[PDB]
Amino acid sequence: ANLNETGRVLSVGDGIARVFGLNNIQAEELVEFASGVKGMALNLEAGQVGIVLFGSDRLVKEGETVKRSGSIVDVPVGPALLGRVVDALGNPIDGKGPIETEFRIRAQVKAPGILPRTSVNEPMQTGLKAVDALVPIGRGQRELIIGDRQTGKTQIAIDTILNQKRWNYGQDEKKKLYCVYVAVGQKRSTVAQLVQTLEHHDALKYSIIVAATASEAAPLQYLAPFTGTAMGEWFRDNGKGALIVFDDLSKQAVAYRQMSLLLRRPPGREAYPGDVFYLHSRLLERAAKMNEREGGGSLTALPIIETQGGDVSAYIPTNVISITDGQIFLEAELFYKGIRPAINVGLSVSRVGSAAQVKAMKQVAGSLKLFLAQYREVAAFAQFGSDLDASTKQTLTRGERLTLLLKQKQASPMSSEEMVPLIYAGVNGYIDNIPVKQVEKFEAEFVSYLHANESDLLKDIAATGELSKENLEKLKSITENFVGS
Amino acid sequence: QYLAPFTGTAMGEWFRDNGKGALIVFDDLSKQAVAYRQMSLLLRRPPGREAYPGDVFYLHSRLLERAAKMNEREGGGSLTALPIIETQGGDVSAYIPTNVISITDGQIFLEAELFYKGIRPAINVGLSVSRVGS
Amino acid sequence: QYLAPFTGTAMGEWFRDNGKGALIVFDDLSKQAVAYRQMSLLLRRPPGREAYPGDVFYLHSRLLERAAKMNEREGGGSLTALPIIETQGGDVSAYIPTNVISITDGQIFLEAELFYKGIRPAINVGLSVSRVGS
Amino acid sequence: GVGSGKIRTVIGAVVDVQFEQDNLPAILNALTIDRGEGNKLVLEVAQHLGENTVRTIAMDGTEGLVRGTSVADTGAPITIPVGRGTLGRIINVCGEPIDERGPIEATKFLPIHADPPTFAEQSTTAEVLETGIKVVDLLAPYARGGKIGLFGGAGVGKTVFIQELINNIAKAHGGFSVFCGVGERTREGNDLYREMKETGVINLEGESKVTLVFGQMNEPPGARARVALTGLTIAEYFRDEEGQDVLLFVDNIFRFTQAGSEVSALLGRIPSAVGYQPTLATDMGALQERITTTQKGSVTSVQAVYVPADDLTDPAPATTFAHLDATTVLSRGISELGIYPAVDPLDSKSRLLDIDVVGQEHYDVASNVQQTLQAYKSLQDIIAILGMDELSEQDKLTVERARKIQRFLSQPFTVAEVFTGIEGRLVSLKDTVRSFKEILDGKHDALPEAAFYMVGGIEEVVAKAEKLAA
Amino acid sequence: GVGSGKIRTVIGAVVDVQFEQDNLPAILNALTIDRGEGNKLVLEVAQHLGENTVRTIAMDGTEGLVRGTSVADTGAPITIPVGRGTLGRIINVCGEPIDERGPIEATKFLPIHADPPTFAEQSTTAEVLETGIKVVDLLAPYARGGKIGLFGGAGVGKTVFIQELINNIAKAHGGFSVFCGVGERTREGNDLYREMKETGVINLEGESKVTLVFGQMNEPPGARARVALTGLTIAEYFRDEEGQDVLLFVDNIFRFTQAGSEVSALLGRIPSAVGYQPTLATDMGALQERITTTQKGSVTSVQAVYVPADDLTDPAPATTFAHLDATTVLSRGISELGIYPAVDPLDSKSRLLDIDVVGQEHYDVASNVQQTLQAYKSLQDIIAILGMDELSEQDKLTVERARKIQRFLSQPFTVAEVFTGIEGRLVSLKDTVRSFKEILDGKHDALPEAAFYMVGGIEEVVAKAEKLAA
C-alpha cells in the first residue's frame, strides 16, 4: 500500500533491479531487499528506480518488497578496524569477531578544498632504494604504480607497508603511518595469502584490508576503493597519517562499466561510460596533507594500473597518469635484464617529492638520478655506434655498478641508515673495482657490519636523520677502511 | 550462401548414415562468413572482431563436427570434410582462420611465395600438418 | 559554417555566368565537414566512418563541381576553386582527405619537413601534381 | 513452488516463458519442456522480464519449438548426480550419462550452481608439483593445489599439452580427477576415452579414477556456457565432502566465456568491448573462484585457455590471468621454428619462482636463463638485418648460448611419439636445474645447437654428441 | 518568472526538472535546489525535452536528491560577483568564495554566458611580450593581448612552465590578472596560492592584484565545463568596464573539452570520433572567441592544453591550434634527455615571426637556428651508425653548433629550484638575440657543449668554463 518508504520490484536481472515505488528515496541511497541483499539506487527515473545489487539476484523475485535504509552509502571508520579483513560494505569476512565502530563516514565524500591543504614535506620511505632516491613520495602525494602484467606492481606496494613497521614501535605521531590495502577484482586465494604475508611480519595489526574479490558483484568492486579511502580518511581528519594502495583501479573501471551498461547508461570511448575519468578523479583527490588547524593529518594514495603490452596510451591509464602527482612505470623488459624492481627511471617521476625527500638522501640522491640519466643513453649504444672510444667510457663502468646496486630482493625494505652508505659508494664510484658478480653480495654484509662496528651511527639517524659535515669526514674514514674487502 | 554448406553436408550425410563413404569440399567458408555477417548485421545483431558476430565460430563448429568416422555399431560409414579458407596477405592470425583452424583436424597451408617461384602446389611444409595421420 | 562554402560559391558563381573570371578559396573544408557532422549526428542521422554521415561525400562533390570553364555560348567565364584540407600527421588516407583528393584536379602537398629546412613555401614537388597542368 | 507456464517467444538459444502470479521460478532454476520420446528439453532462468514472464537459456537445440507449449517448473537449478558412482562415466551438461552404459546411481544430488568458497576457508599452499617438463619445472613451476593456465592461439598445442599431464600426473596422483570438455572437438574426447580405458584409469569391469563431462562444439550456446559448472560441481563434492586431492583439467575454458557472448545480445545487454558482454569479469569470476584449495581438500586445475587471433589484450584471456597462480604462455612464432613445447620463456610465470619456495640454487639458474634469452631476442633486429657478424665479442657468445638454451628447452613429450617418433622423455626437477648450469658455464660450449634439439637433459645430449663425434 | 518546479528524474549528474506551463525557464539559466545551509545546489538548463520538462546539468554532487523537491528558477544564468573586489579571493564556478575570508565586495553583476565580440569590434594587435625565456622570445615569441597555448602530455612540464610565467609577467605587467583553473589538482592550487601570498601579487594586509577561480578535478563534469566561463567573465569586466590589459592564465583548457564529453553521453548525443561530443569546435569556439583583444581593453591568455597520450592528432588539442596566436609544443622526448623547458624548437611556432614586428635581424637569427636543428636532426642516423668521423667538414661544424644550441635552449626556471637545485636564471629579450649570433658565427665555438646546460646568457657560459677547466 505504502510506496514512499517501500516498493515492489518490477524486474531483476544481472544485478540490476528496477523497483516501482520509493517516492521519497535519495540518490545513491542504500536499500534492503526482502532477501537480505543490499544495494544502492543510482539513477532515480520517473516511475521506477534503478537499483544495483550488492549480492546475487537469485534470492529476488518479481514483486519483492524493498525496504529503505534512509541514508547515503556510509561505512564504519576508526582504529577498531586495524587488522581486519572486510568487504566493500564494511562487513567483516575474516571471522575474527564483529566490527566495533567509532563513527561513520560516507563512501562518496568530496575532496577537501584548497585552504585546508598545505604543501607536503613529510616523507614516506617505501624501503626501496630505487624509489626513495629517484622518485620520493611525500605524505598526501599521489604516486602511481603503472606497469604491465606481473612486473612487480603488487610487491612494491607491500614493501612500503612492511617498511612502516619500525615507526609503529615508538611514540612519535608525526612518523606514524597506518596502511590500507584495497583488493579490487583479485581472487580469494591471493588476498588471503597476502593477509598471512602481512600477518607474518606483524604488519596486519596496523593495516586494514578491504577485500572485493572477483566473485562478488560489480557494485562491490566499484565501491571498494571509495569505501577504503573513507576508512583511511578518518586518520587524515584526526591528525594521524595514513596510506592506501588501490590494487587495482584498472579492474574497478571494468566493474563500473557493468553498472553503467546494465543500467542502460550511454557508453562512451572503449565501451566505458563518459565519466570514467571522474570515477578516478574524485577518488585520488581525497588524498592530501592538511593544515595544522584542520588536524595536520595526511592520506597518501598508491594507485595501480595494469597496462596491455606496455600501452601507456590506452584509455584508462592516460586518465590516471593525468591525475596522480607522478607515476612509477614498471617495464617487463627490464625485469629479465636483472633490474628488480624493473623501474624504468626514464619515465617514472615525482613532482613535489624533491622537497619531501630525506635531507640525508637529497644530499647524495639529487645528483645520483642524473648519473643514470646519462647512463641509459650511453649503455644502449656500445655496439650500434661501434666506435671503441675510451674517452667517455668511464660512465659505462660507473652506471653498470650503481644500476646493479639498485637491485633489491622481494619484501626487503632497507632503512634510511642502511641506504645512505651504499649511495655514497656509488655516486663517487669507489666500488667500480669489484666485479658485477660479487657486488650483489658485497651489499649483503656491508650493511650488517656497520651495526656492530658503529651502532651509535644509526641511533643518530633514528632521532635526527640528517648527516652533517662531521659525518662526511667520518664517511671518508669509514670508506678507506673497507675498500680491501 | 550460409545454408549451402549445411545442406551439402546433409546431402553427404546420407552416405555417412548408410555405412558408405562421402567427401565434401567447402569452397569456401571465408565467403560464407561474409554472407552470415550480412544477415547478422541486417538483423541488428552487435558485431565483434572484424565486424563478425560472436556466433561466427558456432556457425562453422556445428558444421564441420558433422564430418567424422562413425562406430562399427552404426555401420562404420565416414564423412571427410575439406574446408577452404582464403587469407589476406598470409594472415594466419586473423579471426575466421583461427576459428576454423581450432575446428579442423590440421591444415594444409599454401603460401603464395612458393607459388610464383615454381613450387606448385606451394605447400608450406613447415606449417602444414595432419593430426590423426599417424 | 556548413553553408559558407555554398553561399561563397554562389557569390563567386555570378562572375562565372557573366563571362568573367572568378577565384574562390575554401579555408577550410576540413573544418566544414566537422560542422555538417555536428548537425547530422544531432539530427538523428545515422553516422558512418569517423562519425561522418553517409552524404558527407555528396557534400563536397556538388560543391566543387560548380567550378568549371564555361563555353563561349554561356559567356566563356571560369570559376577556379582552391580548397584547403587540414590533415592529421600527413594522413592522406583519412576519410575527408580521401573525399576531396578524389574530386579535385590535382593537389599541392605542403610537408612541414621542408618548412623547417628553410624552403618556404614547403612545396612537396615530388608528389604534388596538376592534371590539366599541360 | 511448483506451477506451470507457457512459452511466449523463442529467439535463437533464448526462450522466454510466461507464468502466472506467485508461481514465477527464481533465477538459475531449471525448466522442463517435454519432447517426450527423444528426451527432455531443459531451460535455465536468466532474468525476470516482468509481466509474469521470465527469460531462459536453452540447454539444447531450440529447433521445433512452437509458441504455446507449456513448461513445468522444477523449483531447483539443474540438479546432477554426484558421488563415487560418477567415476568412469561420461556425462552431459544436464547430468545425464551419454556413455549409454546405464543410469548413474547415486544418493546425493547437488545443483550445478553454488556459491564460491568464502574468504574464511581459503588455503595458502605454495607447494611445487613436479611435471617432468623442463620448461615447466624450471621457469614456471606449477603450484600443487593452485591454478595453471595454458594460453596461445589455435594450433600451438594447448590440447596436446593437457593429455601429457593426464598421462604423467594423474596416475602418480592417487586422488581422483575430473575432465570437463567445454566447447572442443568431439573426436578429441572419443580418441581420449579409449586411451583412458587402455591406460588403467578407467575400467568398466572394475573401479575407475577419472570422471568425464563433455559439452562440445556441436552443442548450442546454452550447453557450452554451463557444462563447466557441471564438471566443477562434482569436483567440489570430492573436496568438501570426501576431502581428497582432485585434479581439474579444463579444455577449453574460453568457450564458457565465448558462449556467453552469443546469448548476451539476445539477453538485452549493451555489447561491451570487442562485442563481448558486460558481465565478463563477474561471470568468469563466478566460475574461477569456485576452483580453489579450501581447508577441507585441495584442487589442482590446469586449464587450457584459447586466445582469439593471438591477442592477449583480448577481453577474454586478459581477465583470466588474475585467476591463475601459474601461467604457461604458448607462442605461435616459437612453434613455427620447431620448438616443442612452444612455451614462451619470457611470458610464462609462476608464484613458486621465489627463494622461499625452491631456494637460491634454483632461483639463480632461472633468473640467469631468462636474462640470456632476453639478451638474444632484444638484439633480434641487428641479427636479422646487419647479420650475426655485426655484434660485439660477448653479445655474440650470449647468442650462441641462448640458441642452445632455446632449443634445449624443447622436450619430446610422451604423446609426441606419433608426431616425431622419438620416445617420450621425463626429466626430473633437479636434473633440469644442473643441466643449465653446465650450459651457462664454460662446459659443453663446444657442442652445436642440433645436439640440444628434442633432448631430455645433457645425459641425452652427449648420447647424441657421441653419434655426432663419430 | 521566478517560481518553483519539481524534480522528475535524477541520473548521475543529469537532473530533469518539471515546470508548469508558461513558467518555462530559458536555456542556460540557473536553477537552485535549496539545501538549508550555504553552497546550495545549482543546475544549468541544457535542453527543453518538451512537455514542460527541462534537462539540466548539475554543478555539484547529486547524492541526497529526492524526486519531487521544489526547484527555484532565478530567471538568469549563473551570475558571479565581478569587479576589483574579486582580487585575492578563491571563488568557485557558482560565484561563491571558498577561502572562508568572508563575502565578496562587488556592485555590478554579470552572467557567465555572453555573446563574443563581433567582427566589427575586433582589434589587430601584433605586440611582442617579453617573457624572460630564451627559446620562447626567439623562435616562437608570445603575442601580448593574444592566446598562447602550452601542449604535450602528462609530465612534460606544463604547470611548472605556467608558475614560471607568473613570476616573470604578473609583476612586469601593469594590469590585473585572472588565474582560472579548470579540472586540475587541488594541491597545485594550494602550492600556487602560497606563492601568491609571498610574491606580492596577493596580500591580506593590502588589496591584492590577481583573482583565483578554481574548479578542481574532484568536482563533477558540470562544474569543470562551465568554470572557464566564470573566470572569463571577471577578465572581460576588466577589459570592457575597466579598460585594463589583463592576463588570463588557463590551466587546463583540455578539461573544459573533456567535461563536455562526460556530459554529452548522458544528454543523449551520438558520440563523435574518439568518444568526443559532436559540439566539439562550437563549444570550444564559444569560449575561445570571447578571449580576444577588443578596442576597449586587452586580454592576454596563456592556456595550457593537455594532449591525451602525447597524441597531437587527438580532436581536443587539434581544434585548439586554430584559435592560438602562438603555440609552444612540449615534446616528451626532450624531457627524457633532461632538457627543460622541453619546448620543441621546430614545432613551436608564432604569428609574430615576421620582419614587420621584430625586424629582419631577429627573424634571420631564429631562421638559422631551426635550419641548423633540422640539419642536425637530418643526420641522426649517420652519427649513430657511422660515428662522427664519417661526415663532411661543413655539416660537422653545424652538428657541433646544434648540440651547443639545443643545450643552450634549456634554461633553469625560477620555480625549478627544487627540481635541479640550480638557482633560477632570467634573461631579457635582446640579450638572447646577440647571444645566439655569437654561437652561430663561431665567436664562442670554443666553449664546451656541457657549459651551455642550465645557464642564462652568453656571458655566463664563460664563467662556468673557467671553473670546470680548473
Add this chain to the structure above:
Amino acid sequence: VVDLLAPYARGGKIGLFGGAGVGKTVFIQELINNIAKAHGGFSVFCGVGERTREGNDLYREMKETGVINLEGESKVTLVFGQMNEPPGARARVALTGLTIAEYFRDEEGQDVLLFVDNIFRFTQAGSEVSALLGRIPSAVGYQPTLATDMGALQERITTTQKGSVTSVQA
C-alpha cells in the same frame, strides 16, 4: 602485350590499373575501335561517379578520334553519372549501362564491352546509401551487402550461347 601476357577473358572481368595522365582514356578508345572491327560488337562506357570535366573532356576526345560522329553513326554509348548526383544515382549507374550491354548480347547476339570507371566509386556509393538506410556498417564502414551488391553487378556479366559481355573495370 595484351593478347600475350594478360589475355582478356571473353565474358569475363578485367581490372584496369594506372593513374591518370599515363594514357588510360586512349586505351579504352582503342578497345572500342578494335573489337567493333575484330569481332563486330559494340562497347559500353559507364561513368560511375566521376568528374564532370573528365566526362566533357572524354566526350570531346571521342568526337575527334573517330569513335563518335554526330553526322554519322557512332560505335560506343556513353552513360555518365557525375559526382554532383546523390549516392542513390552513383550506385545504380553501373546497373544502367550494363543493361544496354545485355541488349546487344541477348537480342542482337554480339560480344559487348562494358567499361566501368571507376568500380571503387560503385562500392563507395553503395556504402553511402547503406548509411542512409541505417543498416549497421560492416568492416571498415562498408555495407553488410558488400559481396552481394558487388555480385549483383558482376554475375550479370558472363557468356551465353547467344552472346557475351566483357567488362574492363578500372
Add this chain to the structure above:
Amino acid sequence: SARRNAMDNASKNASDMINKYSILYNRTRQAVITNELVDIITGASSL
C-alpha cells in the same frame, strides 16, 4: 668486396622486414576503423 655482402643482405632483409611491417600496418588501420566505429555504433544505437 665483403662490405657489399653485408650491405646487400642488409637491403634484402630490410625489404623482407618492410613487407611484414606494411601488412601489419594495414591490419592495424583496419582494426582501428572497425573498433572505433563499433564503439560509435554501440553508443549511437544504445537509444
Add this chain to the structure above:
Amino acid sequence: TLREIEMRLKSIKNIEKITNTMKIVAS
C-alpha cells in the same frame, strides 16, 4: 601497438635508404 608502427616504419624504410646507397658507393 599502433603509435609505434609508422614510427618503426619510417626508421626501417629510411634504413633501406642507407644500405641501398652503400652498395653502389662501395662499387
